[PDB]
Design an enzyme around this catalytic site. Structure first.
Site, PDB file in Angstrom:
ATOM      1  N   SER C  31       0.850  -1.176   0.000  1.00 42.93           N
ATOM      2  CA  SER C  31       0.000   0.000   0.000  1.00 42.93           C
ATOM      3  C   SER C  31       0.889   1.230   0.000  1.00 42.93           C
ATOM      4  CB  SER C  31      -0.903   0.012   1.231  1.00 42.93           C
ATOM      5  OG  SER C  31      -1.569   1.258   1.359  1.00 42.93           O
ATOM      6  N   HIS C  59      -6.605  -9.275 -13.928  1.00 42.00           N
ATOM      7  CA  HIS C  59      -5.282  -8.728 -14.216  1.00 42.00           C
ATOM      8  C   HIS C  59      -4.152  -9.421 -13.457  1.00 42.00           C
ATOM      9  CE1 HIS C  59      -7.567  -5.442 -16.101  1.00 42.00           C
ATOM     10  NE2 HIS C  59      -6.448  -5.173 -16.750  1.00 42.00           N
ATOM     11  N   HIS C  81      -0.461 -13.504  -0.546  1.00 45.83           N
ATOM     12  CA  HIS C  81      -0.819 -13.458   0.867  1.00 45.83           C
ATOM     13  C   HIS C  81      -1.309 -14.817   1.358  1.00 45.83           C
ATOM     14  CE1 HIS C  81      -1.379  -8.946   0.091  1.00 45.83           C
ATOM     15  NE2 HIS C  81      -0.307  -9.080   0.852  1.00 45.83           N
ATOM     16  N   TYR C  83      -3.474 -15.673   3.627  1.00 47.81           N
ATOM     17  CA  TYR C  83      -4.923 -15.820   3.761  1.00 47.81           C
ATOM     18  C   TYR C  83      -5.584 -16.224   2.434  1.00 47.81           C
ATOM     19  CZ  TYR C  83      -4.897 -11.064   1.932  1.00 47.81           C
ATOM     20  OH  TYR C  83      -4.692  -9.955   1.151  1.00 47.81           O
ATOM     21  N   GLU C  84      -4.903 -16.022   1.303  1.00 48.89           N
ATOM     22  CA  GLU C  84      -5.490 -16.419   0.015  1.00 48.89           C
ATOM     23  C   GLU C  84      -5.387 -17.924  -0.197  1.00 48.89           C
ATOM     24  OE1 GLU C  84      -7.187 -12.865  -1.644  1.00 48.89           O
ATOM     25  OE2 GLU C  84      -7.385 -15.011  -2.064  1.00 48.89           O
ATOM     26  N   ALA C 111       0.190  -1.769   4.387  1.00 46.38           N
ATOM     27  CA  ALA C 111      -0.780  -1.008   5.162  1.00 46.38           C
ATOM     28  C   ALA C 111      -1.037  -1.743   6.472  1.00 46.38           C
ATOM     29  CB  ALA C 111      -2.097  -0.841   4.376  1.00 46.38           C
ATOM     30  N   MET C 214      -1.408  -8.208   7.824  1.00 50.96           N
ATOM     31  CA  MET C 214      -1.620  -9.600   7.436  1.00 50.96           C
ATOM     32  C   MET C 214      -0.556 -10.108   6.490  1.00 50.96           C
ATOM     33  SD  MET C 214      -5.773  -9.354   6.757  1.00 50.96           S
ATOM     34  CE  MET C 214      -5.298  -8.328   5.366  1.00 50.96           C
ATOM     35  N   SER C 215       0.577  -9.414   6.410  1.00 50.89           N
ATOM     36  CA  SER C 215       1.568  -9.707   5.364  1.00 50.89           C
ATOM     37  C   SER C 215       3.008  -9.562   5.829  1.00 50.89           C
ATOM     38  CB  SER C 215       1.355  -8.768   4.159  1.00 50.89           C
ATOM     39  OG  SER C 215       1.630  -7.416   4.514  1.00 50.89           O
ATOM     40  N   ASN C 238      -5.434   3.119   9.309  1.00 46.92           N
ATOM     41  CA  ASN C 238      -6.579   3.182  10.220  1.00 46.92           C
ATOM     42  C   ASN C 238      -6.124   3.074  11.668  1.00 46.92           C
ATOM     43  OD1 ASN C 238      -6.078   0.367   9.121  1.00 46.92           O
ATOM     44  ND2 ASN C 238      -7.368  -0.149  10.880  1.00 46.92           N
ATOM     45  N   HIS C 252     -12.410  -1.220   4.560  1.00 49.58           N
ATOM     46  CA  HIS C 252     -11.402  -1.506   3.530  1.00 49.58           C
ATOM     47  C   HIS C 252     -11.306  -0.413   2.456  1.00 49.58           C
ATOM     48  CE1 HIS C 252      -8.775  -3.736   0.816  1.00 49.58           C
ATOM     49  NE2 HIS C 252      -9.714  -3.741  -0.114  1.00 49.58           N
TER      50      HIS C 252
HETATM   51  N1  LIG Z   1      -4.905  -7.267  10.200  1.00 46.80           N
HETATM   52  C1  LIG Z   1      -5.027  -6.001   9.812  1.00 46.80           C
HETATM   53  N2  LIG Z   1      -4.601  -5.632   8.593  1.00 46.80           N
HETATM   54  C2  LIG Z   1      -4.711  -4.361   8.176  1.00 46.80           C
HETATM   55  C3  LIG Z   1      -4.363  -3.724   6.994  1.00 46.80           C
HETATM   56  C4  LIG Z   1      -3.707  -4.374   5.774  1.00 46.80           C
HETATM   57  C5  LIG Z   1      -4.782  -4.729   4.745  1.00 46.80           C
HETATM   58  C6  LIG Z   1      -4.425  -5.251   3.511  1.00 46.80           C
HETATM   59  C7  LIG Z   1      -5.433  -5.558   2.608  1.00 46.80           C
HETATM   60  C8  LIG Z   1      -6.758  -5.333   2.968  1.00 46.80           C
HETATM   61  N3  LIG Z   1      -7.062  -4.833   4.154  1.00 46.80           N
HETATM   62  C9  LIG Z   1      -6.127  -4.530   5.038  1.00 46.80           C
HETATM   63  C10 LIG Z   1      -4.701  -2.441   7.117  1.00 46.80           C
HETATM   64  N4  LIG Z   1      -5.247  -2.239   8.318  1.00 46.80           N
HETATM   65  C11 LIG Z   1      -5.269  -3.388   8.989  1.00 46.80           C
HETATM   66  C12 LIG Z   1      -5.720  -3.732  10.256  1.00 46.80           C
HETATM   67  O1  LIG Z   1      -6.218  -2.884  10.995  1.00 46.80           O
HETATM   68  N5  LIG Z   1      -5.598  -5.059  10.678  1.00 46.80           N
END
Ligand SMILES: Nc1nc2c(Cc3cccnc3)c[nH]c2c(=O)[nH]1
Ligand SMILES: Nc1nc2c(Cc3cccnc3)c[nH]c2c(=O)[nH]1
Ligand SMILES: Nc1nc2c(Cc3cccnc3)c[nH]c2c(=O)[nH]1
Lengths: 268, 284, 280
Positions: C31, C59, C81, C83-84, C111, C214-215, C238, C252
Site C-alpha cells: 500500500s 489482471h 498473501h 490468507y489467500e 498497510a 496480514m503480510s 486506520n 477496507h
Molecule cells: N490485520 C489487519 N490488517 C490491516 C491492513 C492491511 C490490509 C491489507 C489488505 C486489505 N485490508 C487490510 C490495514 N489495516 C489493517 C488492520 O487494521 N488489521
C-alpha cells in the site's frame, strides 16, 4: 469435504426445502447442554441430506429440527462440527451458509466454557460481548482461502460481532425473571483443542484479558457475521480454571432463558 | 505416513519385540545433553529405525536414528536416538507413533531433555530448568498433535493436563541434584513451545516473558501431550543453552554453534543426573 | 513447485533470458508504492504469466526491471498473501528468485492498523522488529525440509530490520521535511483475512505491538534466511478500535483511500532512500 460455494450451498438448501415448508428466521446451535420444546416440529437427520456434513456417529447422527418456538419459526442444529475433530473449514462453514439461504436472520448459540475471570462462579452465564480467536490470529481462520463473494466480503470487520441490542435484551429477560445475578458479560477466547489448558496457559489467557475459554463457536460466529447474520452467544461456566501448578444442571434454566428471549425478539 | 492407530502401533511393537527380549519400563528421549547417556547403557542392543517397518524415518546428515534397549542403573530402558520435530514437516501421526509404541512395549515413565533459551532474567547459561508446566502455542492455535479423530485405544477425547510434569519425579530430581552437589544449577519453570524453525525476535522474547514463560524451545510438548494422553508419567528438563535477547538495540544473538557447544559441555553432568535419578525411581 | 535450488534456478534463468538487468535492490510494492512502479526508468515489464513455474496472482502481476535513482531494481507488482491459501513454497520462491538474480536489499511497504495510541492516520511506522503469530504457532514459512542452498536450518532474526537502513530512512525523512510523520515500532502479523476484534487489538497492544497487518513477515523471514538485507515500513491506514462500545470500524475502502493519499509521499521517500544507499 466439498466447497462451501454458492452452488453447493444452494443444492443443499433446496434439498432441505423439499422436506419441509418451514422458513426459519432464527437459527439455534445448542451446545451445552430444549430441542423438544419446539412445537409442530419436523426432524431431518443429517444422513438424509446430500452433501451435508456428517457427525460423530458412535451410533447416533445429528439432526436439523424445524418448527416454532415462542411463536417464532426456528431451525435447530443438533450436533456440531468442532475443529479439533479434524473437520475442514468448508465443512464447518456450510451449515451456517445453508441457514442464510433458508432465511435465518439471527443465530443463537450456547456453549460450555472454563471460567478465567476470578469473580466467576460455577454455573454462571457469561454472555459473549467479544472474542479472541487464537487459531484465526495464527493462520487457521475459517475464512482462509478464496473468498466466496456471494456470501460476503474479502476483509470482514467484526465491529459489533455480538449484537449489543440482543445482549441488552437477554440481560433484561434474566433480570425480570429473577436470575439476573447469574448473568455476566465477557470475552471468550478459543483454544483449538482438544486438550484442556495448563495452569500456565490459563494464567496467560487471563492476563490477555479473557474471561472464559472454550474450543468452539468463534468459527461459526465468523461465518455468520461474514454473511450478515446477527449473533447472540452465551457460555455456561462448567468449571473454574485452575491457575496454579501446585493445586445438565442449568439446562432447564438456559432453555427457559432462550425461550423467553425469542419471545421478545423484535419481529420485522 | 501410517495412522497412529492401535492396529499400526501393534504391528510396529511386535516387529521390535522380535528383535529384542528387553521389556522397557523407562523411555528416554535424548535431546541436548543426553548424547553420552546412550553409551552408558549396559547389555545394550541397537535397532536402527531403517530396520523397523513403518517406524518413522529420520534426517541426521544421512545417518539414521536408533532405538536402544538395555539397562541403566539396573533398570530396563529404551532410548530414542533421533527425534521428530514439527518444523521439519513431520505429521502428527509420525510424531505420535514412537511414543505410542513405547506404551505397548511396557514403558511407564518418559524422561526427556532438550535445549532452550532462557527468558527468566535470573537464569544463567548452563542452568537446568526442570519443566513444571508448559504453554503449547501451536496447540492453542489448532495445530495440536491430537487434532483429528481420537484413537480411543490410547486415551480419551479431551485430556486434562493437570499434573503433566509429575510433581514426585520433580521432587526426586531436585533431591538428587542437591545431594550430589549441584543443586545450585537446578531451577523449575514454564516452558513455551515456538513452532520454529526461527529463533525468537527480541519482541517475541519480551512478549513470551511477560506471558510468564521461563524458557523457550521448539520441541517436546507434542511428545509430552501424547505421553500423558496414554497415561505415561513424564519428566522433562531444559538445558539453558543461551540467554534470550530482549532488546533490539543489542548485538548479542542466538548462535546454533554456541547452542550445540553448551549442550556438549553439560552433557556429562546431565547424563550423570539422569543415571542417578533412574537409580532411585520407585520400582513397582 | 518446491522452492529448492533446482526450481529457483530454472525460473531465474528464464527471466534472465527476457532482460539483461541485474537487480541489486528488490522492491515489494504494498500500500503506497503504486506510483513507484511508474517512475522506474528504462523499464521492462515481465508478466508473471510469461514466467514458467512462477506463482500466479489473483489482471496478472508483473515483475518490473529497470533503474531508479540510478540504481538497478526489480519491483514485484502483485503479492502472495497467506490468507489467500498460497503455500509456503509459493510465497518463498519469488524472494529466492531475487537472491539468484543479484538482489542485496529488499524494500517493502504495507498497510497496517495502528495499535500504539500515539499514532495518527497516515503516519509511517518503520519496522524495527516483529511478532510472527503464525510462526509461533507452527505455520512458519520455513516449516519443512530446509533448503540448504539458501540458508541454515535454524536462522536467528537478530538484526532482521537492518538498523543502518532504518537510520538512513529517518535521516531522509528529516531533511525532506516530513520527519514528523515517521515512527519506528513493532509489527504483528495476523494470519487473516479478518480485521481484529477490539479484544484482539487490546491483547496485541498489551503484547507490545505498535501496528498490525496480514503480510510481510513471511517474505522478511525468507529474505533474512538467504542473507538479503531488509527495510520495511507500514502506512497507518486506520486507528485500531480497542473498545466494544465504539461505533468506529475498520473499512477496507478507507484503508485503500489512505494508501492512495500518502502514495506520492511514500514513493518519493523510497526514491530518495535508494539514492543514498551505500553502493558497493
Ligand atoms: N490485520 C489487519 N490488517 C490491516 C491492513 C492491511 C490490509 C491489507 C489488505 C486489505 N485490508 C487490510 C490495514 N489495516 C489493517 C488492520 O487494521 N488489521
Ligand atoms: N478449552 C476449554 N473448553 C472447555 C469446555 C468445553 C467442552 C470441553 C470438552 C467437552 N465438552 C465441552 C468446558 N470447559 C472448558 C475449558 O475449561 N477449556
Ligand atoms: N525457539 C528457540 N529454540 C531454541 C533451542 C532449541 C534448539 C535445538 C537444536 C538447535 N538449536 C536450537 C535452543 N535455544 C532456543 C531458543 O533460544 N529459542
Amino acid at each position: 469435504s466439498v466447497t462451501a460455494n454458492i452452488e453447493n450451498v444452494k443444492k443443499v438448501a433446496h434439498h432441505i426445502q423439499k422436506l419441509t415448508s418451514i422458513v426459519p428466521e432464527i437459527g439455534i446451535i445448542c451446545g451445552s447442554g430444549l430441542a423438544d420444546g419446539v412445537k409442530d416440529k419436523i426432524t431431518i437427520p443429517y444422513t438424509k441430506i446430500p452433501n451435508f456434513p456428517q457427525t460423530s456417529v458412535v451410533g447416533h447422527s445429528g439432526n436439523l429440527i424445524f418448527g416454532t418456538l415462542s411463536g417464532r419459526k426456528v431451525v435447530v442444529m443438533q450436533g456440531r462440527f468442532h475443529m479439533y475433530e479434524g473437520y475442514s473449514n468448508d465443512t464447518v462453514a456450510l451449515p451456517i451458509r445453508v441457514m442464510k439461504l433458508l432465511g435465518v436472520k439471527i443465530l443463537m448459540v450456547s456453549n460450555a466454557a472454563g471460567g478465567l475471570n476470578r469473580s466467576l462462579k460455577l454455573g454462571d452465564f457469561v454472555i459473549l460481548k467479544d472474542h479472541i480467536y487464537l487459531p484465526g490470529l495464527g493462520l487457521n481462520n475459517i475464512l482462509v482461502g478464496p473468498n466466496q463473494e456471494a456470501f460476503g466480503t474479502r476483509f470482514p470487520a467484526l465491529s459489533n460481532a455480538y449484537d449489543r441490542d440482543l445482549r441488552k435484551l437477554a440481560v433484561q429477560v434474566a433480570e425480570e425473571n429473577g436470575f439476573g445475578n447469574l448473568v455476566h458479560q465477557g470475552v471468550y477466547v478459543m483454544n483449538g483443542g482438544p486438550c484442556y489448558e495448563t495452569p500456565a496457559e490459563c494464567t496467560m489467557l487471563l492476563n490477555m484479558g479473557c474471561d472464559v475459554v472454550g474450543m468452539s463457536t468463534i468459527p461459526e460466529v465468523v461465518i455468520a457475521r461474514h454473511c450478515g447474520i446477527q449473533v447472540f452467544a452465551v457460555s455456561l461456566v462448567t468449571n473454574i480454571s485452575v491457575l496454579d501448578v501446585e493445586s445438565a444442571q442449568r439446562a432447564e434454566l438456559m432453555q427457559s432463558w432462550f425461550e423467553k428471549i425469542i419471545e421478545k425478539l423484535p419481529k420485522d
